[PDB]
Design a protein around this nucleic acid. Structure first.
Ligand code: MG
Ligand code: MG
Ligand code: MG
Lengths: 483, 71, 139, 50, 201
RNA sequence: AAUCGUACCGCAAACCAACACAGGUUAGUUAUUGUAAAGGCUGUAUAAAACCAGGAUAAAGGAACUCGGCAAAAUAGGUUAUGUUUUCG
């Protein structure tokens, strides 16, 4: 039926779908985008947007040991986002709730500002605020057998093969089932909002804050830790002032943290988050609350699950606490203190198995992010810092970073000889002579420190160690002699 | 032939979708070195004892991967 | 040493011009380098073998490093696994040529069509001027 | 069915069945070599080359 | 740049069904004066096609397609002709030309037609009532109106599930597999660079 | 890090069939809704005999043909209330 020359469209819809699913490089994506961007339906337009953020990270990792990234790529990555952003606005009226989530996240993830998208999202947010926060609201259903004329405008059903869909039985006694969808859209609106669309975005968010505050029920499945962080930053960036909404949001976060700790038995092992395990099935995908056993398939090459976390982790605690510092004035002190204590308990329990310490690996970026929030909030605790130092590798850190870590441990009253020894030993191996002291570089800091700068770092480390009260050791003695 | 009995081995380009970081955090407005020195000096030299630790502490354990629900 | 060769005689590649070794009619992947009419002994030898049809984005490929990680531990399965990996590598050379030949055909057709339009325009313009002269002459 | 295709060449088969190493492995094969030396044939086995 | 027929009543359309030429003489003269005089006809009219014959046809189809998308109910071909001309000016001359454009859209599922119901085949063949046409906002893979498309999709969805499980029960893969063919060569890389330059300019 | 293969033919006028033989010859890959991207290939000069081979159409009749419906032609496909036979499938 689709043979010959099409006088209206240059490319067949089915062929265009094949190319989109077959993208692995930005150059290939640019070839598709720059030719057929005006002939994509909402299904195709939003699919491209979601892939672009992942393709950019892939190319940065293709660089070999002795090569460098091509300078022409990053400019092209933002060029493609702008072109797809315009097409997203044109077909915005025909997108589903899920499709709007994909397009909005891609621009927000890439930190690309677009006035046209921000204005379109502002109107949509107002419409969805009164519908998704209603008590008598039902979950989004993918099991569509006879689509309506308006659903034929989404492009999902213009396919020559089976359309994958979720095979779960939708809950029938859920309260506000689509809260997570609303939280993500609001965060995208704040991030994508530009200079000429800031007023509209703020007004839409203010109405959402008032509606959220004037609510006497909690969603039956409590909002995910990620969703809570996104909503908190949506208010912080937009400057919405509503203590009633802010306090309620922190209440939900407090409730979730307690629930995770209450339903945890230490005998089983270290605390781990609850997650959704998604598997591929004949008619689509299925979500489970617990993992399957490893399986060998006769047809699939990969049977591993996609893990979507629902509880809090160290990564999310460094973003929720960051939002709290921005919104400190709107949060009661009592609620802030309770959350801080729960955060410490979550960290301590997550790195203990049986009766012995089992540290969990962390990165330097994560540690600094958590500590920075604590300094702003003025929270001092040794139960939150000690687990973070045991799981932090100290082999590729610069001399400056080691000095800062030692100072932080002393201020937080950390009492663990192993932590102190692992820091001084690493610092000593980085302090070289030649008659000028040289402090090596590393992940922690940029460049090397020579002369007085190296001496200052050594003095700070010695001061922290002296206050801590460590017994004399070879590493400290050599540092003192050099400085 | 053109028809395969199972998925082909992963010899083509593999785009990874795991551990994508897009959260918002604070800035880098940390304290100055002089302020840290003053804070350390203010620390009281409390004569406390060290905690009782196990003779052998295992090295850090890697964390499991995470995905996103924007499928 | 570079990873890929960049100086090719494109008349030879398309087939309008003869090569440096006319006895070879279809060069192999490792024979392209020495059949190039612009071959020079002063140029450093590339560290990898690529045909002239390969894109410049192939310089970041590391195929044997990935193969080792996927290596089965059973020797019987390992031998078959390696045989399929070599088959994949060889086929990739002729996927590039097919795309190369299809891509150029589209560009040629577009240019040929554009020339055809211009020629008709000039012929029609010339006739119109002649027609005008006839009316003017007759007053 | 069409006949006349009783020969299906195979290099490994030809060497193993009629090779010099095979002719020298048995008493009867050694006698065959002597018979061909006596007649004075220039090529003794299908396996021979310079 | 539409051109008028020698009768100065309509524009000539670019298709094989057009039997009228384009008047191109420098002066306007009635048909009767010069048609029976015996002079060569090529001095007054152009019987050939324009250099942009194919591009003009594609442009006309877009104008018709866009107008239908703006409509809210199926309409006749006569209404389509009047609406397009009023919006843009005198660019289309006959309803037969518009009909040919619509047939192309119907084949590729860019539009649909609403047909009447008749009691017997002979009545349907002899009927002369005009037809009504609509347009799809995006290209579909099924024929008919949105109600018919939904019905066809439902039957297709059931068939797919039936086939997938029968394959699984008989020890076949539920979903067919293929290999990914690399379609990015040096020619494609140069096309992308050319495209960026054109977009920048 | 040495050593051996790398030209050309390979559903074929170059391999097995005495031939430039309508035969035989393994695996891996590619475009295509009702079609089909790349690539590859190419026939002494005429026509208004009988007859022969391979197709097409045919008034009225419709197995009268013949050892024999040989050959040819033929709505061929799907869903059925009810009935029959079963080793109950
Ligand atoms: Mg060869
Ligand atoms: Mg008859
Ligand atoms: Mg009879």
């Amino acid at each position: 039926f689709h043979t010959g020359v099409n006088l209206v469209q240059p490319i067949d819809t089915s062929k265009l779908t094949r190319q989109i699913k077959k993208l692995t490089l930005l150059h290939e994506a640019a070839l598709t985008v720059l030719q057929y961007s005006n002939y994509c339906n909402p299904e195709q337009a939003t699919e491209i947007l979601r892939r672009l953020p992942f393709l950019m990270r892939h190319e940065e990792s293709r660089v070999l040991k002795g090569q460098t990234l091509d300078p022409k790529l990053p400019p092209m990555f933002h060029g493609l986002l702008h072109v797809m952003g315009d097409r997203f606005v044109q077909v915005f009226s025909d997108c589903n709730l899920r499709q709007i989530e994909r397009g909005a996240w891609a621009l927000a993830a890439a930190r690309h500002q677009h006035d046209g998208v921000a204005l379109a999202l502002s109107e949509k947010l107002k419409q969805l605020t009164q519908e998704l926060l209603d008590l008598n609201a039902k979950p989004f259903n993918t099991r569509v057998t006879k689509p309506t004329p308006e659903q034929l405008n989404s492009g999902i059903f213009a396919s020559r093969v089976l359309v994958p869909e979720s095979v779960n039985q939708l809950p029938v006694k859920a309260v506000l089932p689509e809260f997570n969808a609303l939280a993500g859209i609001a965060w995208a609106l704040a991030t994508v909002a530009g200079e000429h669309s800031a007023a509209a975005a703020k007004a839409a968010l203010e109405q959402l804050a008032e509606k959220f505050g004037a609510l006497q029920v909690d969603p039956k499945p409590l909002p995910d830790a990620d969703s809570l962080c996104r909503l908190a930053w949506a208010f912080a960036k937009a400057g919405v002032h509503n203590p009633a909404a802010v306090d309620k949001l922190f209440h939900l976060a407090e409730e979730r943290l307690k629930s995770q700790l209450q339903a945890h038995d230490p005998a089983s092992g270290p605390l781990r988050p609850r997650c959704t395990y998604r598997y591929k099935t004949v008619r689509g995908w299925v979500d489970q609350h617990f993992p399957r056993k490893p399986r060998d398939s006769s047809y699939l090459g990969d049977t591993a699950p996609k893990i979507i976390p629902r509880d809090f982790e160290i990564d999310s605690l460094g973003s929720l606490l960051s939002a709290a510092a921005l919104l400190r004035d709107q949060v009661p002190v009592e609620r802030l203190q309770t959350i801080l204590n729960l955060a410490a308990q979550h960290t301590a329990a997550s790195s203990v198995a049986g009766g012995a310490l089992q540290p969990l690996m962390v990165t330097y970026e994560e540690v600094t992010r958590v500590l920075a929030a604590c300094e702003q909030l003025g929270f001092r605790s040794s139960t939150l810092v000690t687990p973070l130092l045991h799981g932090l590798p100290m082999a590729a850190l610069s001399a400056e970073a080691l000095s800062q870590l030692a100072a932080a441990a002393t201020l937080h009253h950390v009492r663990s000889r192993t932590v102190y020894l692992r820091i001084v030993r690493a610092f000593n191996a980085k302090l070289s002579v030649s008659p000028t002291l040289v402090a090596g570089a590393g992940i922690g800091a940029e460049g090397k420190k020579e002369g007085e700068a190296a001496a200052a770092l050594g003095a700070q480390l010695l001061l922290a160690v002296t206050k801590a009260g460590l017994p004399a050791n070879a590493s400290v003695s050599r540092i003192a002699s050099l400085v | 032939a053109k028809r395969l009995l199972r998925e082909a081995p992963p010899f083509t380009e593999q785009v990874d979708e795991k551990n994508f970081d897009d959260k918002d955090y604070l800035g880098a407005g940390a304290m100055s070195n002089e302020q840290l020195r003053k804070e350390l000096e203010k620390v009281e030299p409390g004569e406390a004892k060290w905690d009782e630790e196990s003779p052998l502490i295992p090295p850090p354990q890697p964390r499991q991967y995470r995905n996103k629900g924007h499928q | 040493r570079p990873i890929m060769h960049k100086n090719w005689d494109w008349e030879f590649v398309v087939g309008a011009k003869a090569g440096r070794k006319p006895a070879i009619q279809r060069p192999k992947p490792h024979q392209w380098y020495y059949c190039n009419p612009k071959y020079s002994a002063e140029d450093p030898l590339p560290t990898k073998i690529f045909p002239p049809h390969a894109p410049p984005t192939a310089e970041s490929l590391d195929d044997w490093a990935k193969f080792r990680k996927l290596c089965p531990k059973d020797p019987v399965e390992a031998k078959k696994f390696r045989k399929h990996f070599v088959r994949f590598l060889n086929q990739r050379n002729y996927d590039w040529r097919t795309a190369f030949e299809r891509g150029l055909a589209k560009e040629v057709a577009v240019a040929k069509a554009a020339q055809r339009a211009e020629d008709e325009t000039k012929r029609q313009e010339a006739w119109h001027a002649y027609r005008t002269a006839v009316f003017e002459s007759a007053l | 069915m069409k006949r006349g295709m009783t020969y299906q060449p195979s290099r490994k088969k030809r060497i193993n069945k009629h090779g010099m190493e095979k002719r020298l492995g048995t008493e009867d094969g050694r006698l065959t070599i002597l018979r061909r030396l006596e007649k004075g044939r220039w090529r003794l086995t299908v396996d021979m080359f310079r | 740049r539409p051109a008028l027929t020698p009768s100065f009543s309509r524009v000539s359309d670019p298709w094989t069904g057009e039997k009228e030429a384009k008047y191109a003489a420098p002066y306007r003269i009635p048909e009767e004066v010069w048609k029976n005089s015996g002079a060569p006809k090529i001095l007054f009219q152009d019987p050939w096609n324009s250099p942009d014959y194919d591009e003009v046809r594609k442009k006309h189809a877009v104008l018709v397609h866009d107008y239908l998308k703006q409509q809210s109910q199926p309409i006749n071909v006569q209404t389509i002709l009047e609406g397009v001309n009023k919006t843009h000016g005198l660019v289309l001359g006959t309803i037969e030309y518009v009909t040919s454009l619509l047939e192309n859209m119907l084949w590729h599922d860019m539009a649909y037609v609403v047909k009447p119901v008749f009691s017997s085949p002979r009545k349907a063949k002899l009927s002369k009532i005009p037809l009504l046409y609509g347009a799809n906002k995006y290209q579909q893979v099924f024929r008919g109106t949105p109600k018919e498309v939904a019905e066809r999709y439902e039957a297709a969805r059931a068939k797919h599930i039936k086939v997938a499980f029968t394959r699984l029960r008989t020890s076949k893969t539920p979903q067919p597999f293929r290999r990914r063919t690399d379609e990015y060569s040096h020619v494609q890389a140069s096309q992308s660079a050319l495209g960026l330059a054109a977009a920048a300019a």
